[PDB]
Design a protein around this ligand. Structure first.
Ligand SMILES: O=P(O)(O)OC[C@H]1O[C@@H](O)[C@H](O)[C@@H]1O
Ligand SMILES: O=P(O)(O)OC[C@H]1O[C@@H](O)[C@H](O)[C@@H]1O
Ligand SMILES: O=P(O)(O)OC[C@H]1O[C@@H](O)[C@H](O)[C@@H]1O
Ligand SMILES: O=P(O)(O)OC[C@H]1O[C@@H](O)[C@H](O)[C@@H]1O
Lengths: 263, 262, 263, 262
């Protein structure tokens, strides 16, 4: 099957940032024809730790910027919703509606996404056990979703730390396509006090682990200059490294694929 | 004075709310040293299963809660799940409750603060005690003046929660602290299509809460927990409420002498 | 029943330190007649994180120093063993043989303590679940132990941190007398890099929690000047505070006792 | 070259050791790119139950292991539990293994280092990856020159272990790293009087280990795990060993190009 790579800047800092990142993703989609690229970026960070952190420029602006990426680069789009009413308008541009980790249990939000007809990707809550996502998929199917994804993004391990239990990949694959979020999996929630931290040095090794185990795609946030990102600056991958990382996971996936267990 | 938040988990009917409210009123008259606040959710917006009980709607819920406040003269508290619900709920709710999974949703917090009502935030199972400082800050920015933080357990491996009592003194640095004696013993998704829990530990842990030191306790109670349409594994039998309250007042009286300052 | 208080300096830094601490414990045992005091101190710290940390002055010296405390103050004694052969000689002075947390599963060590005829107190491993201690008691009974204690000293919670799940008290009470270790429960394993850290400000509050829940005794390490301790300096209680803490737990125990559930 | 530690968990009999040793020898001849080390414990000193299988003694165990080394010319590794066992075991063991629960016992570590043999320490379920720096230091102080650190899971709530693969690169800073594919999927005391485990995850996680990067893998194997007198829930069927090894060599070959330096 076609491997999915969801990538883009964490937040829509500006329409210009999106086009800059989108141009590279478009170039990569031309080379890596066996990959299905989906451009990602949030029109709003509705769950920042601090009231003083960057949130975004609103839904209207965000959708407009995302539509510009799809229009100019012919790229598929995905962004996350935070309250039920946002589903309808976001569905106008988003091919995949993303459900935030903390909100993976909010029935109304899941139902709102499901009835749009768009695909739905649920970030697995840090409080959820792999087998607890079965009910998440059931809600979505009940709501009309035909294309469902579950994203592994780490589990609460003590305070301000997350661990990735790779056993979750084959488990969640029993009821949905599985995506591995390579950048949030290394973040240290609230690690910096007023903001979450992260350990970039582990992004690549853990992504190699994910593809060796077997998943249906990877989620990677990238920015031209991570250090200047208005959000998740500790975990966003330098745009220049995207190509190399993608080539690596395709190679590892190929050599490992024959050993992937049938679920 | 000591705060005691109690009532049925979900508003299964205003009939249920009146029966429980009646007992809470009787206790209210018996323990003048305590401030009772009646709690009940008009909607369970985070059930594990799509087929589980959610409720009868915000309008039915607000009406029933209003009945309780008018008939028993009890303060009210219920939780909201989306920003637009803050305003209508503020009509009856003396304290607006913010769900644990939603403790980081800025718009929900601000919406609650805007109503001018008191705000009680359930500490997320994914949050560290010190991470709540930022939660309180958002609320103050939103104009909230009476803010509470509720301990309800922390993710400990899969389908299990642990109560780190160090959180009580830590959170006390920036807000009034409440101990949720009901959900702290629940086992998330432990029953497959529902969450479980161990009632035998409710009392022991609540005794620990007052020995450590907290500004109040949160306890869900139902006449027949077994028949509850929600959180049946953790809800306390209405008949046992009085005994537990008297017990925590006694322990608090003696232990309060040692509560550390600030 | 008579409440047990196990206290003393973490390690036998010198015979003089033991006598100094012992004099205070003797004085307290005279006032708190309803309490059964047991003097504790390790003749060896066999599990320090660093090879450069203080271990002790040997078994022979340690036993001699402990015997001096029992002889001079008529106090009961308890110390921990690390290998099977130490049981016999330690049993000569120790009324209660303590089994280290990391060693709570070493069958031979448990058996060695059990056959001495002395009481045995097992520190619950940081890797053990409350219900896993049942088999620990079974081994001891099999080995001849008639007086068994299980000590709560925290559970691994993420890295370099421990949490106390007070549900363990009523659970372990099903098969043994339960002791709460008020000082190790607040330590941060390896928190200081080459040594473990600790948070003293939580010692008293958590001990209040333990007695409110209900236990058969408390374990508290104390030192005249914690800051100068050659081990566990972050968690040892100033000797001057011992009396106050003891009085407090007796008061809380009394008021709470009528509510203690029958196991 | 890549290290592969394999063999039956416990020395149930030298007969069992010879049968398994025979297959490991055959693989040894088939994969010259790999260095095989035969493993088997002469004693299970940490069983949950007093009634469970422990072994036939150090003398019987050392003799059987010596048979394996002499008949198949395979290096040997077995674990010790008390300081005095280091010396006699060093007679046959090329690598002395230190049990996870005992990774902080200074005298055990020093005793192992003194023999001059290689030392492989199972990382305690209570240890953080960075805490192992001190473990290696003790061994160097004791005179050890060939030191390994083995990842075998970390305590994650009750009766469960999680593998934090970030530990591989972190521990690589001070020792050669081995991934225990067998015990990493075990569920401590999960079966009441014994530990459980989920075999279905052994292979997937071992693939992750080589993709991340490690100096070797540790896998316990038994002709009929079902009949094993120990760790029956995690031991790998002898027939499946070849396939898994070929698979990890292939993955390692491709992924090794990306192993980060230092
Ligand atoms: O405000 P902090 O704690 O940095 O992090 C919240 C972030 O974590 C993720 O949910 C989002 O990317 C959001 O920006
Ligand atoms: O998993 P289930 O039992 O469906 O729901 C979890 C419960 O935990 C709390 O958030 C609510 O009271 C809710 O009903
Ligand atoms: O060397 P560190 O890490 O400080 O701590 C080991 C200590 O933790 C407890 O088992 C003992 O009291 C021992 O001294
Ligand atoms: O709980 P049980 O199955 O008795 O023993 C735990 C096992 O885990 C490992 O230390 C040993 O291989 C031992 O046999």
């Amino acid at each position: 099957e076609k491997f999915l790579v969801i990538a883009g800047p964490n937040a829509i800092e500006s329409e210009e940032l999106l086009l800059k990142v989108g141009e590279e993703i478009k170039r990569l989609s031309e080379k890596f024809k066996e990959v299905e690229f989906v451009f990602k970026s949030s029109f709003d960070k509705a769950n920042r730790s601090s009231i003083h952190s960057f949130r975004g420029h609103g839904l209207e602006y965000g959708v407009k910027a995302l539509r510009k990426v799809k229009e100019e680069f012919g790229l598929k789009i995905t962004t996350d919703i935070h309250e039920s009413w946002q589903a309808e308008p976001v569905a106008e541009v988003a091919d995949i509606i993303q459900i935030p980790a903390f909100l993976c249990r909010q029935t109304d939000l899941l139902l709102a996404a499901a009835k749009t007809g768009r695909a739905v990707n649920v970030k697995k809550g840090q409080f959820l056990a792999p087998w607890d996502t079965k009910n998440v998929v059931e809600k979505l199917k009940f709501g009309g979703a035909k294309e469902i994804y579950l994203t592994e993004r780490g589990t609460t391990f003590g305070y301000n730390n997350l661990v990735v239990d790779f056993r979750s990949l084959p488990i969640m694959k029993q009821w949905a396509k599985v995506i591995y979020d390579a950048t949030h999996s290394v973040q240290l929630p609230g690690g910096l006090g007023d903001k979450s931290g992260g350990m970039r040095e582990f992004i690549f090794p853990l992504i190699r682990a994910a593809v060796a185990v077997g998943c249906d795609g990877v989620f990677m946030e990238t920015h031209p200059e991570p250090e200047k990102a208005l959000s998740d600056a500790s975990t966003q991958l330098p745009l220049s490294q995207l190509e190399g990382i993608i080539e690596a996971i395709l190679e590892i996936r190929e050599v490992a694929s024959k050993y992937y267990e049938t679920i």
